[model samples]
Target: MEPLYDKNGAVLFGEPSDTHPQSTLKLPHPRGEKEVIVGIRDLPRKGDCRTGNRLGPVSGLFVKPGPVFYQDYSGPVYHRAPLEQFKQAPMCEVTKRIGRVTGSDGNLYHMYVCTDGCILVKTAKREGQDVLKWVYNVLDSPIWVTSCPV
Candidate 1:
C-alpha cells in the first residue's frame, strides 16, 4: 500500500484521509501477561480537558474512545501533533490504553491507534514503523479489541 499522507504532503499513517479510524492491537507478554489497551480521542486541542483547565467532567476528557481511567500521559509529547502543523485533525477519538508486549528491542511500547492523521513517535519513521507492522501482523492485527473492553 502507498504511504498515508495528508493533502499538504504530511504522513497520515497506515493510510490517509479526512476520517481515519483504527482499532489497536496488543499481544500477551513473555510472562503470559496481556498487553495494555491505549486509546486516542479526537478533539479541538490536544490537552482540551486534560490541562486542568475545564471544570467538572468537561475538563476531564476531550472527545475520545474507550472508557474512563485511560490516561493522556500528561507529558508534552502527548500534545504534540504528528505533522506538527495541523493543530486539529479532521477526525479524532479519545484513547484509553497503553502498552502491549515487549517492543522490537524489548522496550515498553504504549500501543495506540492513529486514525485520520494521528502520528505516533514510535510509528513515525522507518524502523519504528517496521516494528509496529511486524508486531501487529504477528498478532493478526489486534488492537486491544480481544483482550480489553472498548
Candidate 2:
C-alpha cells in the first residue's frame, strides 16, 4: 500500500461495491477518513456512462462537512432559477427543491448531484420522461472542492 491518495479521486456515498456498486469499494481495512488510490479493471480514465463512468477503482475518499442542514446529507445544494434569479431567493429548502419555474412552464424543476459526480434532473409531472440523467465523466462536468474553517 503506497498510502494511496490523490487530488482527483472518486468518493463513496452509501455502502461498498457489490452492495450499491455505483459508489463504494472493498479493501482489507477501510476508514471513513482515509484516502486510497485504486485501479478499475481495465477501465479508461474518461468515457461514456456504464462503459467507464459506472465502473471504478478510482481514488476513494470520505468527507465530513460541518454546519450542514436543509435536507440532511442527500439532496440539492442550492436553488437557481426564476426563483433565485428573479425573486432572488436564498438557497431552497430540501422540500421546495431546486430549479426554476418559468411563467410558461409552471412546474418546478430541480438539479441533483449524484454521489458519483453525475447530474440528475427532474421535473414535476412530465408526460413520458420526467427524469434526465447525465454522467459527469461524459462531458466537461464541474467537480466541487470544499474547505472548512478550523
Candidate 3:
C-alpha cells in the first residue's frame, strides 16, 4: 500500500519500507491496564439550584468508555455536505493532525484524524515502539484525553 504523508511530508502511516524499517517504528507503550470510568462534576453557577437538594438539575457529565478500535472513515472531508452524500462517499482519504497527548508512560503521542475519521494516537519515529501495542495501551489507560486539544 502507498504511504500517507502530512503537510510537512512526514509519513502519517504506511507499510514498512527499506529506509523506514518496521523494527525502527516509534509507537506508544502499552499501559497493561483496564479502562476506568469516572464522573465529572460541574461547578455551581449563579442562579443554579443548590446542590444539597436531590431535585436540582443534573450538574455533571459522564464520559463513556473509549472505543476499542478506530472509527470507520467515509463521505466528504468537508462537514457541510448533505447526509446522504456523506454516507455514500468512499472511506480512503487524507489523514489530518488533530492534537497531542502525553501518555502514562511519560512519552508524547501525536493525535491524528484516522483514515476512517476516528482519532489515532502515535509516537514519533525516534521512540522506536510498536504501534499496535501502543493503541491497546491507550484504550486501557485513562490519560488518553488528558492533553487532547479542544
Candidate 4:
C-alpha cells in the first residue's frame, strides 16, 4: 500500500514491509499484567470501550476506515468534516516526549500520540521508527485537548 503523507509531502507513516513482518508484542497493561497486542493493528483500536458507549459520550472521536470527522460532538471543522477530504491533511502533534517502549524486537518507539486518538501509518519496523521521529517534529500543530475528568 502507498505511504501515508501530510499536506506538506512529509511522510506520516507507511505499511509494514516484508523484512519486518507484523507480530504480536507483549506490553504491560495500565491496570493489569502483560497485555500482548499488535502495535501495527491494535494500538489504534485498543480502548477501554470496545464500541460506542451507551452510558456516556460516544467512546471516542474520529472515525476509521479513513480519516472522516465526528459531527455528533462539538469541535472544530477539521474534527467535524463529513467527507474524506482530509486525505492529505496534517496531523496534530501533542506528545511532549512522554515515554517510549523498547519493542520486543529490540527497536524503540515513543508514545507519539494519546491513546484515545491515534494516527497510525503502517510501515516496516525500520521505517516505523523513522516516521515516529519525523511526525514528532512537524509544526502547524493543533491544540490536542487533554482529558482528566475529575
Which is the leading candidate under lDDT? 3
Give the Cα error of residue 119 in candidate 2, in Å.
Answer: 0.9
lDDT of 1: 0.25
How accurate locally is residue 68 in candidate 1, as Cα lDDT from 0 to 100? 21
**Clashing residue pairs in candidate 2 (N, C-alpha, C atoms within 3 angstroms):** none
Instruction: Report the C-alpha lDDT of model 3 over 1-150, residue by residue, as the tens digit.
Output: 223222222444543222212221123212112222222223222233222122233211111124222111111111101111112122234354433443333445454444554434455455554231122222121222211111
- What TM-score does each of the candidates earn? 0.21, 0.22, 0.28, 0.21
Residue-level lDDT of model 1, residues 1-150, one tens digit each, is 223222132433444322122212212211111122233443213343333222221112211122222222221111111222213222234233333322223233333445432322243224534223221121111212111221
**Runs off by more than 4 Å, candidate 1:** 1-96, 117-150
**Model 4, span 21-55: residue lDDT tens:** 12121211011111112222222222433442322
- How far residue 62's Cα lies from its native spot in candidate 1, in Å, is 24
**Backbone clashes, each candidate:** 23, 0, 2, 4
lDDT of 4 at 139: 24
Off by over 4 Å in 3: 1-94, 132-150
Stretches > 4 Å off in candidate 2: 1-98, 101-108, 136-150
**TM-score for predicted model 1 compared with the true structure:** 0.21
User: Worst lDDT window (10 residues) for model 2?
Assistant: 64-73
Candidate 2, residues 19-113, lDDT tens digits: the string is 11111222222122222222222322322212223332222222112111111112111111112112212232232122222111234444443
